[PDB]
Swiss-Prot record, chain B:
Protein name, UniProt field: Pre-mRNA-splicing factor CWC2
GO BP annotations listed: mRNA cis splicing, via spliceosome; mRNA splicing, via spliceosome; positive regulation of cell cycle; positive regulation of RNA splicing; spliceosomal snRNP assembly
Location in or out of the cell: Nucleus
Subunit details: Belongs to the CWC complex (or CEF1-associated complex), a spliceosome subcomplex composed of the U2, U5 and U6 snRNAs and at least BUD13, BUD31, BRR2, CDC40, CEF1, CLF1, CUS1, CWC2, CWC15, CWC21, CWC22, CWC23, CWC24, CWC25, CWC27, ECM2, HSH155, IST3, ISY1, LEA1, MSL1, NTC20, PRP8, PRP9, PRP11, PRP19, PRP21, PRP22, PRP45, PRP46, SLU7, SMB1, SMD1, SMD2, SMD3, SMX2, SMX3, SNT309, SNU114, SPP2, SYF1, SYF2, RSE1 and YJU2. Interacts with ISY1. Interacts with PRP19.
A GO cellular component annotation in the UniProt record: U2-type catalytic step 1 spliceosome
Additional remarks: Present with 2650 molecules/cell in log phase SD medium.
Shown residues within the full chain: 1 to 261 of 339
GO terms, molecular function: pre-mRNA binding; U6 snRNA binding; zinc ion binding
Keywords recorded for this protein, A-Z: Cell cycle, Metal-binding, mRNA processing, mRNA splicing, Nucleus, Phosphoprotein, RNA-binding, Spliceosome, Zinc, Zinc-finger
RRM domain ranges (all copies): 135-228
Organism: Saccharomyces cerevisiae (strain ATCC 204508 / S288c) (Baker's yeast)
From Swiss-Prot, chain D:
UniProt entry keywords in alphabetical sequence: mRNA processing, mRNA splicing, Nucleus
UniProt record similarity statement: Belongs to the BUD31 (G10) family.
Recorded GO CC terms: nucleus; Prp19 complex; spliceosomal complex; U2 snRNP
Gene Ontology BP term (one): mRNA splicing, via spliceosome
InterPro entries attached to this UniProt entry: BUD31 (IPR001748), BUD31/G10-rel_CS (IPR018230)
Protein name: Pre-mRNA-splicing factor BUD31
From Swiss-Prot, chain F:
Biased composition (Basic residues): 1-13
Protein name, as recorded: Pre-mRNA-processing factor 17
Annotated keywords: mRNA processing, mRNA splicing, Nucleus, Repeat, Spliceosome, WD repeat
Misc. remarks from the entry: Present with 1630 molecules/cell in log phase SD medium.
Species this chain originates from: Saccharomyces cerevisiae (strain ATCC 204508 / S288c) (Baker's yeast)
InterPro entries to which the protein is assigned, alphabetical: G-protein_beta_WD-40_rep, PRPF17, WD40/YVTN_repeat-like_dom_sf, WD40_repeat_dom_sf, WD40_rpt
The keyword Repeat is annotated on this UniProt entry: yes
Highest classification ranks of the organism: Eukaryota, Fungi, Dikarya, Ascomycota, Saccharomycotina
Chief place of localization: nucleus
CC terms in the record's Gene Ontology section: catalytic step 2 spliceosome; nuclear periphery; Prp19 complex; spliceosomal complex
Swiss-Prot record, chain H:
UniProt miscellaneous comment: Present with 468 molecules/cell in log phase SD medium.
Lineage, opening ranks: Eukaryota, Fungi, Dikarya, Ascomycota, Saccharomycotina
Protein name: Pre-mRNA-splicing factor 8
Cysteine pairs bridged by disulfides in the record: none
Record localization: Nucleus
Primary role: Functions as a scaffold that mediates the ordered assembly of spliceosomal proteins and snRNAs. Required for association of BRR2 with the spliceosomal U5 snRNP, and the subsequent assembly of the U4/U6-U5 tri-snRNP complex. Functions as a scaffold that positions spliceosomal U2, U5 and U6 snRNAs at splice sites on pre-mRNA substrates, so that splicing can occur. Interacts with both the 5' and the 3' splice site, as well as the branch region. Has a role in branch site-3' splice site selection. Associates with the branch site-3' splice 3'-exon region. Also has a role in cell cycle.
Residues of the full protein shown: 243 to 290 of 2413
Assembly mode: Component of the U4/U6-U5 tri-snRNP complex composed of the U4, U6 and U5 snRNAs and at least PRP3, PRP4, PRP6, PRP8, PRP18, PRP31, PRP38, SNU13, SNU23, SNU66, SNU114, SPP381, SMB1, SMD1, SMD2, SMD3, SMX2, SMX3, LSM2, LSM3, LSM4, LSM5, LSM6, LSM7, LSM8, BRR2 and DIB1.
Gene behind this protein: PRP8
Domain remark in the UniProt entry: The MPN (JAB/Mov34) domain has structural similarity with deubiquitinating enzymes, but lacks the residues that would bind the catalytic metal ion.
């Protein structure tokens, strides 16, 4: 079984849940957007969320200019770059 | 003399008041060999120094003054020395008398006694190289230092001129607003090595500002070693002072051949 | 200290000298954390 | 014969109850000196080792002045304190020599510990150290030795 | 020019062991190498400990030790 | 050199020689000595040299931070005790329907405040104004001149605090409300009823307060809690303490809502008797009164 | 060869003045600073009662190829750094001599095992080839922004007032400062003039110089020092309208002064680098108007 | 238990009276020559 299975087991989840309650872990490399921005919390928390969005920007931006030869995919890639751009701004308003 | 030789050096931080030796938890399990945190990501790991040097307050005679110590206390510069007057190293701003003692010694190692290296570190941080007598510091990371006050482009330079003037004789201070960074050049390298460790991870706030209670929450400013100055208005100054250094050495060197004959 | 110098912080050495993994291990970790006879035979002497 | 009061251990002689409250004060300071006070400096960590060698010295100067200087305890008590390890047998035995009167410890006279074949510098008289520093034009650089923190055991000072 | 070994107090050993509980400081970097390079001598320390084990008619047993 | 000189120079040493110079939380201490349970605890605000601990035996025992003195003079259980900053005064309040002042200098009762209807469970000293704030089963707050009566809470008032700026009185009651009081107009400025009895409050030394309940400790300008079964104290280090009646000491950070430690006290030489009734920090230590008849010191 | 190894190359001034020095040999001590490859660490102390251990930082092969000592890494003859040595020989042979060094670890090791000399290490270690170049050094000694709106700033610079005794001010305005002439050299020249030496202890004077605007100001604490700064300056230049200006006199340079009569602060000179260059360009005319 | 560390000698062990060991009673009329010294650590160590 691939490490996708081994990473999501109960014990690995348990110590992250302690590290939330004992320190400054959590990472944020784990979780989603989260769907709303007005429901987000303090800024020092959100800066790491915002930093994560920059990193998928850099993956997408490096992916745009390639000769993948797929006009549909690069159209899709410009769409995520545009939504992550609009996403990068909504955290700035939240900041 | 009146500011320094008159009094004795004072305990900056109590030994119970010293920070904990384990770092802030950025991982799941602590590692005992490498005193760091292992599992989990790596988060951040730069914080504002809780301590700072008040140079006219903390300076004084130490145990290293009577012993003829050449080297300055590293934790005096950080504002963290718990030994006070019982410390083996010096607790004062370097002067021409002090750097004259270090003159045979500064070539390979800094004013704090730490040995220099062949080439610089990749981010220009650290101790320094013995191949270049670098006397210019890159004052960077000012935004986290100010705690994101807008202040301006001149005020920021005023903070840099006030703080680094206490740490020794200055050749020049240049602030660049577009690059949001400063370049401080000292008269001696030993002041630049002292002021680098003194102003690493500090904050340019002063109390006269509202954020003084939140000075700890920020990131802290980076003092690192500076690169060469690329404008030819300064490049011509470099070969001019290198020319004067060469003429001052040839006079000293023909007297060696005069004595040798 | 030997376990932790090798970076094997996911292995817990008990006070009764039992060596147990703290989590479900990836394969690069199970290759890396495969201690030899001289570690375990030293560990079983200390258990005795 | 041990430190622990075992049943193989011999009961105390007559004069022990007079000197027992003094010996307990040296005993409770040794338990507070071994307490693991966590200090991060190496200049402070050996300094806590220097307090133990001081108290083991001061517990042994006490029994030395009881028996050899003031003759205030019996030989059967003084032999009992050595067997029960209240006093260092070999450290007292150096204090009886003419040159080793105020002997730091036993480690500061080992010729084999040092890099040279020399004693510790706390064995040197202070007026000898002032004389050599006077020719060098400086103050004397020695304050406390690394073995136990002494400041001069020379018998002349 | 040989004098014998100096017979330290028992508390001098005892403070050292207690001090080396939490080796988190930078001062312990040399002493961590000393713990790790002593691991080859540790089977000799187990034999000398188990051969001097107190027999059933003994409450306690003072042994003479050599310590780093 | 000479023998008389070396005899003189060896007396220059400060000692005699050879060492004379030529030049989480844990439990540190347990303190017994109250005959009954200990209800309230306050500390000297200037020097930190002493405690003032109430009791269920009607006495007050001043503990050294040893037992210094005993202050009798109440007929019933002393629910609250508060020490003044700018004055050398001690305001104690008990179940005997009286707020009694104490001159710390001579150790005698100076003043008795009157006209409470029933047992007075809270005293808080206003900082600047030389006022007293008392609250009780009267369901009203009385502002005493060391004048104003505030009505609103529909049940008994458990904890009361004072602050210099606006909303000068924060109050908490068993109608599960927390009100912020405008004392000059003598009416409510703001109502915070989000608790589902609020038995404890504590002021952060950030201009905020920490509000307690049975299972949820909130803050007011949350905290992650499972069933803790119910005092609060705020260190200057951010850490926020929570006393439980299930013996559990819930330590928390105030910024986060995070809970970093949960401890369990050892009862005594009954298992139901092991709660923590009151708690306070110094001006790096924690001093907690328990119903097992002991004061415990947490380091 | 591990059993046949050269003796260490250390300076005479590293060893110091004493005759017998007890030196400690460790056969594979640290690794070299240059080649990152192990060697025999020698370390020693100058006197017996010293407090500084002098270690050999580089191996003997890296010390031979550079012709430097192992401890202080200065040249064995002439006792100068390498960067100054290869610059002095470049003034003699009229070509650049330079020891170049690897930044790669496999080429730091490679460059050390070869038996060549590097840079000026052919010239030095030959006493005949060194002494004639010193003679060739001796013949060298026989030779021995128009778009900017700057008008908000020049109202605050004085530029129209005179350097007399009669105003009693703390601050002054120094213009005509070259891009050379460090900030320490102007405070030392003023403190030499007043005898208020070691001024940084008492903070008697505070000086701000831009080095882009070619202008600056120096503020005194204790206004009675201002009359000492006026009276200790003798030479002045009178502009042909009037309005006499004192000259500070750094070696070969001339720096003009006018009492500010208020505190200038930072940012009086400029708030942007492009903006400060035009103030030096603004002044250059007034200096030429003051002199000629 | 393997979770609890080896408890320190001085806070726990050293302060307590040890126990009685295994000793046969050694009848005095039949064993008078050995009963004074049989159960020592080193028997007759200081007898010259
Ligand atoms: Zn220091
Ligand atoms: Zn000594
Ligand atoms: Zn000693
Ligand atoms: Zn010694
Ligand atoms: Zn090399
Ligand atoms: Zn050298």
């Amino acid at each position: 079984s691939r490490n996708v299975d081994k990473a999501n087991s109960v014990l690995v989840r348990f110590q992250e849940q302690q590290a939330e309650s004992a320190g400054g872990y959590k990472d944020y490399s784990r979780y989603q957007r989260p769907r709303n921005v007005s429901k987000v919390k303090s800024i020092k928390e959100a800066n790491e969320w915002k930093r994560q969005v920059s990193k998928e920007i850099k993956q997408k931006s490096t992916r745009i200019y390639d000769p993948s030869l797929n006009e549909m995919q690069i159209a899709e890639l410009n769409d995520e770059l545009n939504n992550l751009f609009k996403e990068w701004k909504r955290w700035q308003w939240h900041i | 003399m009146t500011s320094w030789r008159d009094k004795s050096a004072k305990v900056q931080v109590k030994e119970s008041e010293l920070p904990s030796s384990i770092p802030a938890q950025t991982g799941l399990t602590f590692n005992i060999w490498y005193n760091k945190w292992s599992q989990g990501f790596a988060g951040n790991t730069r914080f504002v120094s809780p301590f700072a040097l008040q140079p006219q307050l903390h300076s004084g005679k130490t145990r290293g003054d009577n012993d003829g110590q050449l080297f300055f206390c590293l934790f005096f510069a950080k504002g963290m020395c718990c030994l006070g007057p019982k410390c083996e190293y010096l607790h004062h701003i370097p002067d021409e008398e002090d750097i004259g003692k270090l003159a045979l010694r500064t070539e390979v190692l800094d004013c704090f006694g730490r040995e220099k290296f062949a080439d610089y570190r990749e981010d220009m941080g650290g101790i320094g190289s013995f191949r270049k007598k670098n006397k210019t510091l890159y004052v960077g990371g000012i935004d986290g230092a100010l705690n994101s006050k807008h202040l301006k482009p001149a005020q920021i330079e005023s903070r840099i001129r006030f703080v680094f003037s206490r740490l020794g004789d200055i050749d020049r201070i240049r602030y660049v607003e577009s690059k949001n960074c400063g370049f401080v050049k000292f008269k001696y390298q030993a002041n630049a090595e002292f002021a680098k460790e003194a102003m690493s991870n500090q904050t340019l706030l002063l109390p006269s500002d509202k954020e003084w209670d939140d000075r700890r929450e920020g990131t802290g400013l980076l003092v690192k070693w500076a690169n060469e100055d690329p404008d030819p208005a300064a490049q011509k100054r470099l070969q001019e002072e290198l020319k004067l250094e060469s003429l001052n050495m040839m006079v000293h060197l023909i007297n060696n051949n005069t004595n040798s004959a | 200290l030997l376990i932790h110098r090798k970076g094997l912080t996911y292995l817990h050495l008990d006070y009764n000298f039992n060596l147990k993994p703290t989590k479900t291990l990836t394969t690069k970790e199970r290759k890396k954390s495969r201690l030899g006879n001289s570690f375990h035979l030293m560990r079983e002497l200390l258990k005795m | 014969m041990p430190r622990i009061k075992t049943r193989r251990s011999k009961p105390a002689p007559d004069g022990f109850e007079k000197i027992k409250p003094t010996l307990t004060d040296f005993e409770i300071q040794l338990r507070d000196a071994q307490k693991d006070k966590s200090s991060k400096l190496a200049a402070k960590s050996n300094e806590q080792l220097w307090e133990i060698m001081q108290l083991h010295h001061q517990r042994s100067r006490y029994i030395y002045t009881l028996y050899y200087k003031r003759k205030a305890i019996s030989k059967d008590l003084y032999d009992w304190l050595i067997k029960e390890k209240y006093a260092d047998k070999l450290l007292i035995a150096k204090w009886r020599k003419t040159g080793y009167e105020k002997l730091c410890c036993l480690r500061c006279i080992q010729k084999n510990e040092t890099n040279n074949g020399s004693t510790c510098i706390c064995r040197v008289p202070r007026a000898q150290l002032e004389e050599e520093a006077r020719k060098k034009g400086t103050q004397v650089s020695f304050h406390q030795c690394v073995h136990c923190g002494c400041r001069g055991c020379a018998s002349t000072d | 020019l040989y004098t014998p070994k100096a017979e330290m107090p028992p508390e001098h050993l005892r403070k050292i062991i207690n001090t080396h509980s939490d080796m988190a400081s930078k001062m312990y970097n040399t002493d961590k190498k000393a713990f790790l390079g002593a691991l080859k001598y540790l089977p000799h320390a187990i034999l000398k400990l188990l051969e001097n084990m107190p027999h059933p008619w003994e409450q306690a047993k003072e042994v003479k030790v050599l310590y780093h | 050199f000479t023998k008389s000189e070396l005899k003189r120079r060896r007396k220059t040493r400060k000692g005699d020689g050879p060492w004379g110079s030529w030049s989480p939380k844990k439990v540190i201490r347990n303190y017994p000595g109250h005959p009954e349970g200990t209800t309230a605890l306050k500390f000297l605000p200037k020097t930190g040299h002493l405690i003032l601990s109430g009791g269920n035996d009607h006495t007050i025992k001043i503990w050294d931070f040893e037992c210094l003195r005993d202050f009798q003079g109440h007929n019933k259980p002393i629910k609250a005790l508060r020490f003044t900053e700018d004055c050398q005064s001690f305001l104690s309040s008990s179940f005997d329907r009286s707020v009694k002042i104490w001159d710390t200098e001579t150790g005698k009762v100076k003043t008795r405040l009157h006209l409470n209807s029933t047992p007075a469970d809270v005293e808080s000293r206003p900082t600047n104004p030389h006022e007293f704030i008392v609250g009780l089963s009267n369901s009203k707050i009385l502002h005493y001149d060391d004048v104003q009566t505030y009505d609103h809470h529909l049940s008994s008032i458990l904890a009361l605090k004072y602050f210099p700026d606006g909303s000068k009185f924060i109050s908490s009651s068993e109608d599960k409300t927390v009100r912020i009081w405008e004392n000059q107009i003598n009416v409510p400025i703001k109502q915070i009823s989000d608790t589902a009895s609020m038995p404890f409050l504590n002021v952060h030394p950030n201009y905020f307060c920490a509000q307690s309940m049975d299972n949820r400790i909130y803050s007011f300008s949350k905290y992650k809690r499972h069933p803790k079964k119910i005092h609060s104290s705020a260190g200057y280090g951010i850490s926020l303490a929570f006393s439980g009646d299930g013996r559990y000491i819930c330590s928390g950070d105030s910024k986060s809502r995070l809970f970093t430690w949960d401890w369990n006290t050892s009862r005594l030489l009954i298992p139901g008797n092991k709660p923590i009734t009151q708690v306070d920090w110094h001006p790096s230590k924690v001093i907690c009164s328990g119903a097992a008849g002991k004061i415990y010191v947490c380091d | 060869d591990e059993i046949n190894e050269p003796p260490p190359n250390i300076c005479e001034q590293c060893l110091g003045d004493e005759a017998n020095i007890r030196m400690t040999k460790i056969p594979q001590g640290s690794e070299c600073k240059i080649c990152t490859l192990p060697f025999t660490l020698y370390h020693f102390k100058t006197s017996k009662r010293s407090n500084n251990i002098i270690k050999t930082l580089i191996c003997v092969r890296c010390a031979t190829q550079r012709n430097i000592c192992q401890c202080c890494m200065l040249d064995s003859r002439w006792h100068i750094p390498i960067q100054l040595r290869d610059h002095l020989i470049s003034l003699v042979n009229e070509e650049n001599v330079m020891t170049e060094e690897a930044k790669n670890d496999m080429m730091k090791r490679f460059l050390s095992l070869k038996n060549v000399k590097l840079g000026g290490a052919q010239i030095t270690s030959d006493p005949s080839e060194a002494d004639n170049i010193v003679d060739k050094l001796k013949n060298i000694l026989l030779r021995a922004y128009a778009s900017v709106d700057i008008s908000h700033i020049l109202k605050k610079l004085p530029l129209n007032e005179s350097f007399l005794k009669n105003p009693s001010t703390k601050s002054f305005f120094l213009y005509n400062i070259d891009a050379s002439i460090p900030e320490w050299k102007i405070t030392d020249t003023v403190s030499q003039l007043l005898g208020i030496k070691k001024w940084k202890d008492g903070n008697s004077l505070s000086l701000i110089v831009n080095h882009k605007a070619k202008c600056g100001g120096l503020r005194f604490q204790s206004s009675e020092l201002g009359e000492r700064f006026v009276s200790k300056i003798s030479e002045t230049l009178v502009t042909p309208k009037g309005l006499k200006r004192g000259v500070l006199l750094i070696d070969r340079f001339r720096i003009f002064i006018i009492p500010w009569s208020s505190g200038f602060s930072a940012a009086s000179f400029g708030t942007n680098t492009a903006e400060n260059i035009k103030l030096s360009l603004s002044l250059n005319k007034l200096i030429q108007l003051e002199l000629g | 238990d393997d979770d609890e560390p080896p408890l320190s000698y001085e806070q726990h062990i050293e302060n307590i009276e040890p126990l009685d060991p295994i000793n046969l009673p050694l009848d005095s009329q039949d064993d008078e020559y050995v009963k004074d010294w049989l159960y020592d650590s080193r028997p007759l160590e200081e007898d010259s």
